[PDB]
């Protein structure tokens, strides 16, 4: 290939890799879990996709399924989702946790799907369901097996026709950044924890905020990813030749050429800064990442 390069895009103009929304923040925070096991936004510099990582940002935190609906006095309308891949291809249990882009976090999701009724003078509308993700549930969710359950409170049957859906996320309630219930409490094939890092290195976080149900606290719900979706599709798209363990990048003010920080993009798809401190440090989101050179795994960065 040509030498590894990066798409010339400011982080604030990019797409988040774990929740379908803009990238809003750029930071390090050594008080957060150091080596998260995120399954979306996971790619090697050579283009190899890891976990449930999709190419299209539109697949992120979504699923597609053949839906079967029934009404149950006491629960209301229950949906059985037989999962398919979001391009409409058959999903087969394999070397990953779930269909590509399946949510890789926990809590209770409101989802939206196209619904069809055989009620009079109604036919097509969009219906919101509750979908329990994890970390554990009483619903026996098994997206690894191709089956998940959703429900909405209903006084009567909604008289829904069985058919194809694509579930898109409306809100999160009780968000926790731990992998969901992929296989009803059993293990599944996962992308390894992000890392390793040199002593003194910390993960660079691309941050967005998730539409939220919260009765008391107006604080926006943060979610981080290792790389914006544009970088994921770039590596996927290019299949670069990789030499060393790491690439040294400089993050720069385009308009002044000020160096904000240097960082290491490890081949395994995550960025490290040398940061000695305890609490969060945020960075401007209007800089550009420039590839300087290949460097050893053991290369010590200039601290930020």
């Amino acid at each position: 290939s040509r030498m590894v390069d990066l798409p010339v895009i400011q982080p604030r103009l990019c797409t988040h890799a774990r929740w379908p929304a803009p990238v809003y923040g750029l930071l390090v925070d050594p008080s957060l879990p150091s080596n998260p096991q995120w399954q979306n936004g996971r790619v090697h510099v050579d283009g190899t996709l890891l976990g449930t990582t999709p190419i299209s940002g539109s697949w992120v935190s979504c699923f597609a399924a053949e839906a079967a609906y029934k009404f149950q006095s006491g629960t209301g309308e229950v949906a059985t989702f037989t999962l398919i891949e979001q391009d409409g291809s058959a999903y087969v249990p394999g070397d990953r946790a779930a269909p590509l882009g399946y949510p890789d976090f926990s809590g209770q999701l409101e989802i939206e799907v196209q619904t069809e009724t055989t009620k009079t003078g109604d036919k097509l509308k969009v219906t919101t369901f509750e979908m329990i993700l994890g970390p554990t549930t009483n619903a026996d969710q098994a997206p690894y097996q191709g089956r998940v359950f959703a429900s909405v409170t209903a006084a009567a049957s909604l008289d829904l026709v069985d058919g194809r859906v694509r579930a898109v996320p409306r809100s999160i309630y009780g968000f926790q950044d731990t992998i969901p219930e992929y296989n009803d409490g059993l293990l599944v094939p996962l992308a390894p924890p992000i890392g390793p890092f040199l002593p003194g290195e910390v993960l660079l976080r691309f941050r967005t905020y998730m539409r939220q149900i919260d009765t008391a606290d107006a604080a926006a719900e943060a979610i981080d990813c290792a790389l914006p979706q544009e970088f994921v599709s770039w590596f996927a798209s290019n299949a670069f030749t990789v030499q060393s363990e790491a690439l040294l990048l400089r993050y720069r003010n385009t308009l002044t050429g000020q160096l904000l920080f240097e960082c290491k993009l490890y081949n395994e798809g995550y960025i490290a800064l040398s940061y000695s401190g305890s609490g969060p440090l945020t960075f401007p989101t209007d800089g550009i990442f420039e590839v300087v050179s290949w460097v050893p795994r053991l290369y010590q960065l200039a601290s930020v």
Partner: nanobody
Framework: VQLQESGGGLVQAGDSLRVSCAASGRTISSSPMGWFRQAPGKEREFVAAISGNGGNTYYLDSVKGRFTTSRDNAKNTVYLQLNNLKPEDTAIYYC?????????????????????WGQGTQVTVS
């Protein structure tokens, strides 16, 4: 499935009360449980919840450090310990159970989140 509350009564500000919620017909050892309070003529408001797995609780800001809830799985019973009681606490106290699909870590904080309700027990603070 059936929730029976007892405890509570009339006390002065600063006194303590013990509300018990005894379940029958089915275990609540894995049920998310909530506490609500209603002064007749006002809306039922959230006080406290315990997650299905018993590992996470959450309290109304105004009762943080006064009220504590726990589940005794063996006795199939949830408790609300009401210490340092104030006039604002005067209400009917309701336990509630969630029996629908649940994330087991989530302390459910909304009235629409719950399915089964006790009869309530009155707490009056003079």
């Amino acid at each position: 499935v059936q929730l029976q509350e007892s405890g509570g009564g009339l006390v002065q500000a600063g006194d303590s009360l013990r509300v018990s919620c005894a379940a029958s017909g089915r275990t609540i050892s894995s049920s998310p449980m909530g506490w609500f309070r209603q002064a007749p003529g006002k809306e039922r408001e959230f006080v406290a919840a315990i997650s299905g797995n018993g590992g996470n609780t959450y309290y109304l800001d105004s009762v943080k450090g006064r009220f504590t809830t726990s589940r005794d799985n063996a006795k199939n019973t949830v408790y609300l310990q009401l210490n340092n009681l104030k006039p604002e606490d005067t209400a009917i106290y309701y336990c509630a159970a969630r029996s629908r699909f649940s994330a087991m870590h989530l302390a459910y904080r909304r009235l629409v989140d719950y399915d089964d309700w006790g009869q309530g027990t009155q707490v009056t603070v003079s």
